[PDB]
Amino acid sequence: GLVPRGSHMETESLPWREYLERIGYQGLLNNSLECLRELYTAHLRSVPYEMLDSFDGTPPVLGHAESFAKLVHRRRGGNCLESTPLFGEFLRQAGFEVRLVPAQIWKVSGEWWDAWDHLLLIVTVDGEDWLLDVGFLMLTFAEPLKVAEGPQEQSGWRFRVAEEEGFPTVSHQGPDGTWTAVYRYRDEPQQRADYEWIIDFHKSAEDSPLVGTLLCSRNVPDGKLIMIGENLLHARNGRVSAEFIETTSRAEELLRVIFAGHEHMVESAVRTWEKARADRS
Numbered sequence: 001g002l003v004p005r006g007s008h009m010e011t012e013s014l015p016w017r018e019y020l021e022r023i024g025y026q027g028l029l030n031n032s033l034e035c036l037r038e039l040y041t042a043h044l045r046s047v048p049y050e051m052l053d054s055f056d057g058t059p060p061v062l063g064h065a066e067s068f069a070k071l072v073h074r075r076r077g078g079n080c081l082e083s084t085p086l087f088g089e090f091l092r093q094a095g096f097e098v099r100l101v102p103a104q105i106w107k108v109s110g111e112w113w114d115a116w117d118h119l120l121l122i123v124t125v126d127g128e129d130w131l132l133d134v135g136f137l138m139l140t141f142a143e144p145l146k147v148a149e150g151p152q153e154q155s156g157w158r159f160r161v162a163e164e165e166g167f168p169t170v171s172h173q174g175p176d177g178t179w180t181a182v183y184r185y186r187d188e189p190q191q192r193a194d195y196e197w198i199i200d201f202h203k204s205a206e207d208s209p210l211v212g213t214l215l216c217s218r219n220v221p222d223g224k225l226i227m228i229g230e231n232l233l234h235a236r237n238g239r240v241s242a243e244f245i246e247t248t249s250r251a252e253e254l255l256r257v258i259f260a261g262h263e264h265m266v267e268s269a270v271r272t273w274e275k276a277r278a279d280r281s
């Protein structure tokens with residue numbers, strides 16, 4: 001084009017009308033908390049988490065205009081580098097007070113991932129801070145999480161923010177009653193230049209989890225469907241259940257739900273599921 005890439009001019013004339021169409025929000029906007037809640041739900045329900053293009057090791061491009069093109073025009077899915085900053089930029093231009101902050105994810109094994117490679121939004125409405133995450137693979141909060149003390153109930157799950165070992169830590173209350181971390185964050189506002197390093201980290205990583213694997217998920221009302229390789233986690237109204245996917249037929253049934261409304265991604269996703277299952281046998 002004639003408008004240089006990365007310029008404030010490029011990101012300022014992005015057609016947000018088409019973005020709200022992409023995430024299925026055909027209403028009026030104001031800056032109330034109720035509008036924030038509906039935008040967040042719309043994005044979570046409309047955009048699946050998918051890392052398909054990086055199965056290669058091919059990195060994402062980071063521009064707002066490039067995320068916008070992939071997500072809005074090609075109607076691809078999202079993740080923490082391609083969805084969350086763009087959503088934060090849209091909210092900024094719609095008048096919300098928004099801050100992008102880095103996070104570190106808690107492994108199922110029971111430890112932190114080595115890098116602080118997640119991103120989160122904090123939105124300030126009427127002098128309260130609200131957490132937002134539109135780029136997370138597994139189970140997190142589907143309504144904005146108040147940065148305040150004590151359990152917060154959502155869809156039969158209990159979430160909380162609490163200061164643990166010096167960091168605000170988002171946890172989830174398990175079936176027993178014990179709490180498990182989802183991730184911790186730092187209140188350190190990020191720009192593109194501050195989280196760029198993440199691409200190099202996974203490029204130069206031995207065995208990055210976002211390369212050579214199948215990772216996708218979809219919020220549904222009251223839960224989420226998460227596919228990790230040959231496993232499916234179905235979170236529904238305070239319960240999670242697990243199923244081992246045995247046949248490509250079965251994986252394709254499930255990928256059609258996860259990618260409902262995104263039928264153009266199913267073949268690629270089914271190919272990736274087979275190529276990933278093979279490459280661990």
Ligand SMILES: CCCCC/C=C/C(=O)SCCNC(C)=O
Pocket residue numbers: 054057058059060079080081105113117118198199200202203209210211
């Ligand atoms: C350059 C190819 C790979 C893309 C780089 C990573 C992107 C992300 O989405 S980083 C969040 C990853 N999640 C955990 C637990 O590490």
